[PDB]
């Protein structure tokens, strides 16, 4: 009877190990950002606003994760 | 109806078809066109020179 | 695991195709090609 | 460092590095080929089809 | 200029004075590559005489190699090249460096 | 073959060619290579630093001013240079630091310039670091 | 289904009967359809399967290709012909392609057919495991080839179906008719456009995998 | 317009009509035994 | 109710781990872009249409994820 | 026969799991396309066939993996 | 017979989960090969064909895993 | 009350795994600080904010599951 | 009576896992092969048999896993 | 309480897992540090303090897994 | 008695998922043979033993993992 | 009182899924040392103390998933 | 006391788990061994006893999870 609850409280737990391709994502792309604009130091103003974008994109998948456990929580 | 929402998506991608695609591919075509026709008149004008 | 017309018909129906295509269509693609060949030189 | 892209060449790389270690050093390591390294003296000019000279500029 | 004046469009004086130094060398050869953009051409000439012993001379020519037959070539696997480095432009400028400061 | 063969030559004074070396540690592109005995073949540029060549004599300090990391399979590698360096001669601070300093102050030049200067200072700390 | 195969043979027979005009040489805006695919379908033979025998063993790669580009171009209409939602003849006919080019394998070499299985040059101690590592890989390559088209085709097919079904209160009771309330026209959308995407691009990528195990038959590696 | 041309028919199709034939075997074959329906 | 809709919750939470695939892969793709574009500045207008076809294609399989997701969600 | 549609719903989930290696395949394809056509621009017209097969074998990955979903689930 | 029926289709559910690598690494193969192709232009005709017989053999490995996962399902 | 406390305890520990995420993130980031800043000593004053902020936005969605696991956990 | 063949078939099902390791053993091998192979195409015939042990023992892993699995499974 | 201090005991030994993060992450940031001071001497100076930054920065990944833990256990 | 068999093969295919390691790592020290023979093949000879005897033990971490497996079978 | 003690077993054997940190962080950290000593020997007494605080670090996170399964299990 | 070893059995195989870092790290230590030999060949001399002793250090890692698979196991 509590089962359905229940079941909807680990879904939501391992829903928000949606979270782990949000995180790794920002790490690589912005290590990547860093290590292009160490490669090129006149390239910072060109690569940071394109940048925004898939960052925006990135954080795209960590709030879709998170709304998806969040339907398992409330 | 799940039977409305198709047809109006499959128009949806036949406007966009035209207004994209088929502009671009038109372009292409009429150009493959076009070197085909210099080729075939290089062709004659080839032809005509070895004559003359 | 009825399969009379779905595997039978379309069997036949692309040894349809496997033969008239190479019979007909690619043989007239070649002969354009070749034609246009002919004529350039 | 950013000689590819915001310097001038590679070359001028190699320019600077010699002008530095030549230029950059004890009074008596600045020999007579330490001189001639010093002064340059190549006044390049752009011609043209009717040898148009622009300038003589330095290098 | 007497013989091709059109095809001639650089001119360079006051080299000839002394022996011979490194530093005038490569600002030629920077100035070549800026203005000119010697990697555009796929070979470079550069003319000078070679003495045998003592007098004989012959009008010895040395190939230049552009950055596209470095970065490409039958045998550039033997050799460890660092893609990030640039290392194929690197080598076609420091070639055009070199063989032009000693052909000179 | 045996150790390495290296030609460490100059347009002025050439130092080494084919000469025994056990050590020919080099500051690469990107940092610096240690050469030991029949290295892999690589060409790939250097920035100034020292050149770190271990022979039979004592410790030889040779700071060079550009030049290849240029090594062939018959561990026959050919470090070319344009300027020497003296082991204690050349280790000199007041005139390197006179001039960094009015490099740094005329540094304010066209981009142009202003690359260049950029260039030297940053060669001129190079040389800073190589003091010791 | 009989009758929904037919369809795509008659559309592909106009691509050229009813097409040319007059039969010009210059080509119909039509016949240039063909004969652009007729190029890339030889240069990537050649490229792949390049050698002597290469073109008496391209037409039935080429039949295969057109079969499966127009059976995918087909599964864009909304009562999609996808097969009629079966798609088993792609597993069928993966299964004679298998049989096709072992036959091909074993009367071109014969005996050294064995010898497909196993590279020029292994150690001895190693060859008797690597046989079999090697085996039983080409043995299961004749599902490969079927779960890969039948997984674009009919996953498109039932994806647009679920969200088609899926979408009942968008418009008529909810009061968010903008993009947020359409989010399922938006994804259908977006998702056609993957699906004829990843047909052209799977149907010439099968094109590439038949010719390689027909170069794995008739010659030796 | 319509061109019969004699192309090669079964001289290098011959092993796929073995497999068409083995794979109708299969099919008659289990429309009783594996159908299961 | 009961275990069949604890386990249609169980799977919603279970299927959100295929947005792992989703998230690495618009990520190497944004930095492959900044690295590619990084290595000379001249490319930018040959790799961004090639660049939104990447990264389009890899939220179309977080889409793709995500509804699987949703439907599992749903009876 | 409730917890056999259940666990039904179970594997199809526990198999959709499977497309974040798709997900990674067809970035990585993709990937190698940009960085290949990026340190030289003459290679982009032979690359970018072999990187949208990339994402054609990629992606088929994952739908093959969630092939078993679907028939878990249908 | 039907929480025999349920583990079954867990087990084909966690069967197709032995793809993840062979979805992420027949994707790298042909990346590597379209990385080297454009390090030499000239080298595909030999890097290519055993490149897909890589391929083949790379694919084996979910074929497999799907193969288990059919017979845990059948 | 019961089972229902259980599976808040069970979603809370298999949730707070989602820091992985933050632990990578760190983990590349800081690698790309590291290599640009040795590969380019001048180029500090860049690499650093840009380094900064990747570490913050991976360990925001690192942490992303650890505040929902304290909200599953209590 | 039943859970036990249960229990075998979810064993047999989490025992071939261990295809996609081989997966990734023989894709990387692949994939670093041919990036070497790129350069100097002379390196063939000796990169050829030492690189066909090493799939064919990455494969055995792998087919070890799947006579694991058969094993629990019959 | 009972199964309630069983899914305890779970969600501890679950919480645990996710020290891979710190693991990874101080690592390769480490890993990282020691080929740039490698590379040039220059820069150990400038690298170290970050290094412990990052050093500190993981280690708080590891105490947030360690104190969800122990959250659990007592 | 029943689970008592039943959790000896949940065991032993928990265990038979642990050849990932060996499966990876075998064929990553196998693809720095491939890379380091292409820089330079003079020197295979030495490099060939040493990568023998570690791959070896390499797939002896596997032996190990089926051992603990052979042991929660039989 | 079968369930704790199964829950505290089941506990200190997830335990040891931290051991990917340690082991996983030692050998990259001296991947990265050897491949930088090949690169040059002479700061082999400089590169090494990082190099034991680096065994020192990894090893730490792996007695931290040592002390929780022991805990766990006692 | 037919859960204390089923559970013990769970255990032991989850415990053997954490030999997969160990098969990753002992293999790819000596990767960049003789990723560094094929850099410089006469270096294998000084190269080797440090990445040997990391190379036994993990296969130690990976021997503790082994041992406490067999504790709860064999014990």
Known sequence: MQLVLAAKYIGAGISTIGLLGAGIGIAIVFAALINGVSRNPSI??????????????????????????FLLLF | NDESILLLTFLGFTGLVAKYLAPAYKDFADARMKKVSDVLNASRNKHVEAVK | ??????????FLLMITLLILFSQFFLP???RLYVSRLFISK | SAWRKAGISYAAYLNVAAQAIRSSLKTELQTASVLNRSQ??????QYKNGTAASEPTPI | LRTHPNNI??????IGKDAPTFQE????????????????????????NDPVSSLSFEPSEKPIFNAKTIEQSPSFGKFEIDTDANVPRDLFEYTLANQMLTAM | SSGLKLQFALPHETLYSGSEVTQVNLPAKSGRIGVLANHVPTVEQLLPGVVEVMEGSNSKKFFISGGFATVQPDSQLCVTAIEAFPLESFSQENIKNLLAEAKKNVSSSDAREAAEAAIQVEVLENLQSVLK | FSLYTIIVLLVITSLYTLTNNNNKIIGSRWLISQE??????????????????????????????????????????????????????????????WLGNTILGLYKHGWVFFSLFVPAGTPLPLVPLLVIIETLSYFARAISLGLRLGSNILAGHLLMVILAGLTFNFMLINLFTLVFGFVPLAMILAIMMLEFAIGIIQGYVWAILTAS????????? | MLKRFPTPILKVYWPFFVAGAAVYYGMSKAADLSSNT
């Open chain 7, 36 to 97: 652009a695919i007729y190029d890339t379908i030889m240069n990537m033979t050649k490229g792949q399967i390049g050698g002597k025998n290469w073109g008496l063993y391209f037409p039935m790669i080429f039949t295969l290709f057109m079969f499966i580009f127009i059976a995918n171009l087909i599964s864009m209409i909304p009562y999609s012909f996808a097969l009629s939602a079966h798609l088993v003849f792609i597993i069928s006919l993966s299964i004679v392609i």
């Open chain 5, 25 to 48: 060398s490569a600002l030629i050869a920077d100035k070549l590559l800026s203005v000119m953009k010697a990697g555009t051409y796929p070979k470079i000439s550069i003319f000078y």
């Open chain 3, 28 to 30: 007239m693609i070649l």
């Open chain 3, 1 to 10: 695991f009825y399969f009379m017309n779905q595997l039978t018909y379309g």
């Open chain 4, 40 to 45: 340059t003296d190549a006044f390049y000019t």
């Open chain 1, 44 to 69: 910072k103003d060109t690569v940071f606003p394109m940048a925004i974008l898939g960052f925006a994109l990135s954080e795209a998948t960590g709030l879709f994760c998170l709304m998806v456990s």
């Open chain 7, 213 to 221: 195990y027909l170069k794995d038959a008739v010659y030796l590696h």
């Open chain 5, 9 to 14: 469009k650089l001119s360079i004086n006051g």
